[PDB]
Symmetry: C2
Subunit: 271 residues, 2 copies
């Protein structure tokens, strides 16, 4: 139905909903590849949960469309660009602005975490801004989505546990990345410098980083707790939400969403 | 300046001309402060000196070292040929025999370095280089020890990196260097990375598993060598000796020969920087 524009399995073409004349980005994918997948059921569940998710900081997926060969996911279009574009214009950002933004991210992540969903590839590409300027997080519950001369990063955030190549607590992983994002906003670089990869990994494993001088002591403390390499000893979302630095000028959003709509919808999600 | 007329600027590498002989070189220029006050000043010294003394047709040469009260200057052979992988872009895969040539050169070079007691620690395409003649030459050998080598723009692939390295702890350098050669060889032949770059956490999963799917066009013996090289276990990973003995590796191969003096008085090595 959508008046689609343009544009290996994730050609996110632009489009518009003709009937309400609104244009929303569509992530398109081979129907086959997904439906056969170890995570297929989780994909369905995660897709369905989010589909019903409604939060000021989370980019929404309006609808899922089905084809014989392809699946179309309909996702809100955020013009405000990437937040880190804003950083690049300025280098680092201010404590206050940064805290406003970090709070938003944490709240959105908490919301997603509450519904049993984890990101697992939380990075700045995902960080986005709505026209009014609010943070919308993206690719949430989309990570499970199946899978030359130039390859661009960055695996800097990738939590140590992931480095192991085994199993990781999703929440612990997401928070770790959240720690890094916070770090980049304030400091205007990555806590662990990319150029030397083996050394980068050693640094990540040791959690040894160069703090900037301008970071206040608390922020540093919060970051150390966020950037614990050990998932068991690392801070909880709850823990950080109750932080002294985090707490400042804080205010809790509260959403009003449907209790998870009939799974029947979930089973019928793809056909 | 100190025999050299410097240009600008490719850590900061710069183009330079050796005036006295009137020949041309690239120079790495860095602060004295950063190098001397590093956990690894001693290792840096040893390896640097070894390189200065090394001489091999496939290894980018370290002519000499210049020291200032404020900074350290490293002179290196200049190669016009550029990245080998540019060649891959043109024709996708390289052919089996040619790929074998290059692999022979790379293995020879690494082996020579390894014998001399030095390990690369960061073998990636940037380092693989070509000369006017079309021969391969390998850079940043003995410079991984170099401090903090070298924002949004990042051009690093972790695919080559060995798994043990992934941990962030300890490994024998050689096994890691062998792993990269394994990846390097694979990419040449196949015209892609063994493990998909995207979905990085799954990417790391693949690497630690050492799960990769060879193309059909790969011959059985090459597959064997790749499999043996791409052992996620570094105690069960093939040594340079093994790979040199390997069948597919044996084919048409001829040991390179070069002459360098026994490592010049370390006293020189300690006096390298002052």
């Amino acid at each position: 139905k959508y008046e689609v524009g343009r544009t290996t399995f994730a050609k996110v073409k632009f489009a518009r909903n003709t009937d309400t004349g609104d244009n929303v980005a569509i992530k398109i994918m081979a129907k086959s590849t997904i439906l056969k997948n170890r995570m297929v059921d989780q994909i369905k569940r995660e897709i369905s949960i989010m589909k019903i998710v409604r939060h000021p900081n989370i980019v929404r997926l309006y609808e899922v469309l089905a084809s014989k060969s392809k699946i179309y996911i309909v996702l809100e279009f955020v013009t405000g660009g990437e937040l880190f574009d804003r950083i690049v214009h300025k280098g680092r950002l201010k404590e206050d602005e940064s805290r406003k933004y970090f709070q938003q991210l944490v709240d959105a992540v908490a919301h997603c975490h509450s519904k049993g969903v984890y990101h697992r590839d939380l990075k700045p590409e995902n960080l986005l801004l709505d026209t009014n300027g609010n943070l919308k997080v993206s690719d949430f519950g989309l990570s499970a989505l199946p899978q030359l001369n130039d390859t661009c990063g960055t695996p800097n955030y990738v939590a140590p546990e992931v480095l192991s190549g085994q199993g990781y607590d999703g929440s612990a992983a997401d928070i770790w990345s959240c720690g890094v994002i916070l770090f980049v906003i304030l400091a205007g670089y990555l806590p662990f410098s990319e150029t030397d990869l083996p050394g980068l990994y050693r640094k990540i494993n040791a959690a040894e980083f160069d703090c900037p001088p301008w970071f206040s002591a608390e922020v540093k403390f919060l970051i150390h707790r966020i950037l614990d390499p050990n998932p068991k000893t690392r801070i909880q979302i709850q823990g950080i939400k109750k932080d002294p630095w985090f707490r400042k000028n804080y205010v809790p959003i509260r959403a009003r969403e449907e209790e998870e709509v009939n799974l029947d919808d979930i089973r019928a999600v793809f056909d």
